[PDB]
Design a protein around this ligand. Structure first.
Ligand code: 1XC
Ligand code: 1XC
Lengths: 473, 472
């Protein structure tokens, strides 16, 4: 079972002895520190953490003894604060005397603003604020996934709108393929859930259950998929029977959408001779609601897509849409599910545009690019102390490294407000109390072991919408 | 609870309908595919997955119904294979009719070799082999962490030996700082455990319980740490009182090693004036078993390390070792715990050598670089079907994309052998049965819901040792 006493960086076990004597308050905040890309971030994921790890009775006698025994060997010494944790158990029935204020999940906030704050509600538990820094900082991941996913939606929206004149099917244009390419099962659920803030297509099943448990949707599920082959279901038929494989598969799924990887041996042959000639009759007979979706999976992502499109364009009846862009017949589509990240996604859609192909024709699948190739330094997600009370006196604290002004932290009690022009501003040094910027936009989401405010997955999605989607009014 | 029926890529739910009819076996393998540097990989992590996710009764009535309900909505259709899963429940009491063979954990294997294979043991469960591809492929992570950590140990070993003449304290030269920088709690435990295959220093506590539960060590714990400050424990004293913070901290931990971040306001002032003059008397009196370990945390990693060393070298008595490199007094050391990955680690030690500073002086902490900034395509960890039996006839199968020969897969039944020169070779097309190449190095680790062979963390560490360590 999880033990919050064992869920922090080792050195933090020793920090209680390091604060100035008579410290009664430690106050800390989390921001996506400012540095041309990623100017605004989607705040998402804290609610998961609060519910799974921080709420209720997270301290027991058994957990204290367990931590005590581990740390004695781990430090080769008795530095573990047994007394502090026993106080929490006895005084608060194992509930954390902590208050956390945060912006609503789904909110899109410019870099450099306070996103959440943490402070102890009991003087005895001054040391507790930064004990849970490590676990709270992991919110960087759902935040970064949601933001990076949304940034890709922006690109897709722009090119779909330009090449087709609408945003139909936008929420199915970037599909989650990252299940095998992430570092764990838990990461898979968290990351997939973060992607679903922006899209509805996912193969990472783990995301569904997490959303249902911690967030909730009106609909039965937040994400969807359709049948598709893998290399094993093609190659198993033997190299000489790839056509037999294709025919069986499209026949088994004749009335629903089906995607078929076509690069096991020769993508260009499979498109031109097998799909385009041998099995063409089984494709042109398919309903608009059940297209064949051809998936290339190798080579240069842009070059392969362009060639595949030129091939299908010569074997199938291509139309020209109202914007002048070429469109495959509605029973035929393409998905590129290899080598896709935010950079290559941009290169492909731009390349398609230059060759007069509508983005209607294509969908994208992304795995490691979507869920694994992200770090905490992408958005500079950072947790710092800004305010302490020692000897009854409030002190505004901060770091300001001489060789890196970018690592400067904010001072004093923080608050988030609207500016007269409708933008966000973070106020420091308790200045929010002056009431010149209206009310603090942060909400208390956690206090004394209880989750005091939460958001449905439907509300989060609403909060995270694009302006171009909002401009459908 | 965890549901194996819900722990696969969505489209795999539909694969049981796509295999050739009359298919009784699907046989797949895992490799770190060679690319036209990481020429060898540490195999570690499978045993965790086997025990946590695959063993025992992993199928129940409720789990089948739950998946049926989820997939009906997820697909807007009834594609879920309720029959197949029910068969496993009734015939084998929810145990997976699967056999997995694997190279022993800790083993260091060149790229392009089979590391494990998976196959079904019951004809009806042909579809099951690749159902569990997704969960098994995630072993790429501890493999890649263990491998990348080991390569960094090679670099540290090389420079430590060259500048000091020995490898003393090597296993404490790269400390795990990655807990806050990883994507989740589970990843934290997995990654920290992989790093501990090569080193003994970690602040990612989660790794310790994972090792104890799934692997085991003779010693109480596999990893260690010492007291250290963070920015909050310094800054809380107020800007004008950094010295008070430093003094109080080194005094609290006078008898044990202590590390103190010194760049809150001005790293160069702190070393030359505060540590180097104001509090110098509290440093020079410390035991060799309890040094102060100064930590910079900003600026160019190499440039700051060099300047700090240059500062400390002129405020403290520096000796010159037998190899000619400069050495701080035993009560004073440095740890660089910011901006460290395998690339910058190389640049830092090389830079130190240029300036005649021994690697004895320095330790490294690595966080995101150690545990997060890694991907599956670093080693090209891949899982492919190589052999099936249809109509009673086994056929060798494989992919070979025209535009990327690097993605070509291996054919037929595989085995791993020692070459006459003592290296490694993977035999394809069942050629291992000819027995010209000694015994298959893969062992059955999993069969029919049971873990059949396990390894202690001690064995794994022994297996993954450096050659240069074996040379001593
Ligand atoms: O097809 C796959 N799923 C089914 C599927 C079919 C079509 C669409 S659609 O056209 O969006 C669409 C959606 C819709 F809701 C409704 C619709 F009508 C259509 C969505 C989904 C499928 C395919 C492949 C796949 N995978 C999961 C991992 N993989 C491979 O594994 C590797 C992982 O990637 P990385 O190496 O980068 O980490 C990579 O090679 C990658 O190809 C899944
Ligand atoms: O000191 C820290 N721990 C205690 C400690 C003290 C000394 C040594 S030693 O000299 O190896 C040594 C070892 C030994 F076994 C025995 C000995 F005698 C000596 C090891 C360990 C410490 C410090 C910092 C720290 N952290 C955990 C995250 N962090 C920060 O958080 C951030 C995470 O990094 P990324 O952004 O790259 O992801 C980064 O700013 C990073 O500095 C931990």
């Amino acid at each position: 079972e999880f033990n919050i006493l064992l869920a922090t960086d080792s050195y933090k076990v020793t920090h209680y002895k390091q604060y100035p004597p008579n410290t009664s308050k430690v106050y800390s905040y989390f921001e996506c520190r400012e540095k041309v890309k990623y100017e605004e971030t989607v705040f998402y994921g804290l609610q998961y953490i609060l519910n799974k790890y921080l709420k209720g009775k997270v301290v027991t006698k058994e957990k204290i003894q367990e931590a005590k025994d581990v740390y004695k060997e781990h430090f080769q010494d008795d530095v573990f604060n047994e007394k502090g944790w026993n106080y929490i158990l006895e005084k608060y029935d194992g509930h954390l005397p902590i208050e956390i204020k945060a912006v609503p999940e789904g909110f899109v906030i410019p870099r450099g603003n306070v996103l959440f704050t943490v402070e102890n509600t009991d003087p005895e538990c001054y040391w507790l604020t930064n004990w849970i820094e490590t676990i709270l900082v992991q919110s960087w991941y759902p935040i970064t996934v949601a933001t990076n996913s949304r940034e890709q939606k922006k690109i897709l929206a722009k090119y779909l709108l330009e090449t087709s004149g609408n945003l139909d099917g936008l929420e199915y244009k970037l599909h989650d393929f990252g299940y095998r390419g992430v570092s764990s099962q838990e990461t898979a659920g968290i990351g997939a859930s973060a992607h679903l803030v922006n899209f509805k297509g996912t193969d990472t099943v783990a995301g569904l259950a997490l959303i249902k448990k911690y967030y909730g949707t009106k609909d039965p599920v937040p994400g969807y998929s359709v049948p598709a082959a893998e290399h094993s279901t093609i190659t198993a038929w033997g190299k000489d029977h790839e056509k037999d494989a294709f025919e069986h598969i499209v026949t088994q799924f004749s009335s629903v959408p089906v995607s078929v990887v076509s690069d096991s041996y020769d993508i260009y042959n499979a498109c031109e001779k097998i799909w385009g000639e041998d099995l063409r009759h089984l494709i042109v007979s398919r309903s608009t609601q059940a297209p064949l979706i051809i998936r290339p999976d190798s080579g240069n992502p842009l070059d392969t897509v362009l060639k595949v499109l030129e091939i299908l364009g010569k074997k199938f009846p291509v139309t020209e849409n109202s914007k002048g862009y070429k469109l495959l017949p509605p029973y035929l589509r393409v998905i590129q599910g290899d080598g896709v990240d935010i950079n290559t996604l941009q290169e492909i859609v731009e390349g398609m545009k230059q060759k007069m192909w509508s983005i209607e024709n294509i969908a994208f699948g992304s795995g490691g690019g979507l869920l694994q190739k992200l770090t905490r330094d992408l958005l500079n997600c950072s947790f710092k102390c800004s305010y302490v009370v020692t000897n009854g006196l409030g002190i505004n604290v901060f770091k300001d490294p001489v060789a890196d002004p970018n690592k400067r932290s904010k001072k004093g009690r923080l608050s988030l407000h609207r500016t007269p022009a409708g933008n966000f501003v973070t106020l420091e040094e308790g200045k929010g109390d002056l009431e010149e910027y209206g009310q603090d936009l942060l909400h208390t989401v956690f206090k004394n072991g209880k989750v005091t405010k939460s958001y449905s997955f439907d509300e989060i999605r609403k909060n995270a919408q694009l302006n171009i989607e909002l401009e459908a009014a």
